[model samples]
Target: MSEKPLTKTDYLMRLRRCQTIDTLERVIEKNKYELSDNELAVFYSAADHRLAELTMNKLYDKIPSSVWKFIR
Candidate 1:
């Protein structure tokens, strides 16, 4: 069975509906490749900063240092 293509609106709706940290992390991972830089910027701006920080910190040792700077 084929599923309909995901849209930005659908992505935003899912992002907004995330009520738990695991849900949020899953959403981000699922949509990571589909999201544009602008879309990510909006998500980052609207997300819980503390949670974002914690998430990013966990990946700090894995990702490039340059990538870390972009988040800040």
Candidate 2:
């Protein structure tokens, strides 16, 4: 069997590419054993950033152009 081991960077990339918010957290929780503490910390930060970005996107989707016009 050929073994193509996943790098920590690839792992994080995959985590951030999740389509849904819950799966990102689920992936991080279940795969916590894959990386060292420093690597895990970096992965955690990536997940957090992705989650926050998604949150902003979802909220912004509902805010409409009027809010931006008013704030400007």
Candidate 3:
């Protein structure tokens, strides 16, 4: 059987479910390769806020400033 389509809510849920920094980064990398530029923009918008979650903030701090510029 074919896989179901991925919805915007699916992405949001995935971001919300990331309990650790590595899982969040893995999700980001997966979407980075799988999503289109427009899709990535939507993903990043949500992910930007998700990164501020207590669990994710540590990894977020390790990300370079240049990467932040590109993601924004």
Candidate 4:
């Protein structure tokens, strides 16, 4: 996949949206079972716009491995 960096405003919005540790924890918990692998990947990418922040290889570290290959 191609990499497009987030703009300053977008970055700031993510930072703001995640300002509280509870919000961060909530994001993780809410997505734990509700999101599929591709959806989770997209969510992570949209949140931080960095593959290193959420590598496909590491996706299963947090989510299920069975769903990891469903990316479009």
- Highest-lDDT candidate: 3
Choose 1 or 3, whichever is better by lDDT.
3
Off by over 4 Å in 3: 1-10, 55-72
| Candidate 1, superposed: residue stretches over 4 Å from native | 1-16, 50-72
lDDT of 2 by residue, 1-72 (tens): 122334445555677567776665666776667756756766765565454445456343254454544542
**Alpha-carbon TM-score of each model against the true structure:** 0.39, 0.50, 0.51, 0.32
Q: How close is candidate 2 to the true structure, as a TM-score?
A: 0.50
* Candidates ranked, most accurate by TM-score first: 3, 2, 1, 4
45: Cα error in model 4, Å: 4.5
**Residue 72 CA error for candidate 4 (Å)?**
27
Task: List the global CA lDDT of all models.
Answer: 0.53, 0.57, 0.63, 0.47
lDDT, model 2, position 48: 50
By lDDT, highest first, what's the ranking? 3, 2, 1, 4
Model 3 gets an lDDT of: 0.63
lDDT of 1 by residue, 1-72 (tens): 122434434444456566777767776765555667656654544453434445576432255555556665
Q: What is the lDDT for 70 in model 3?
A: 57
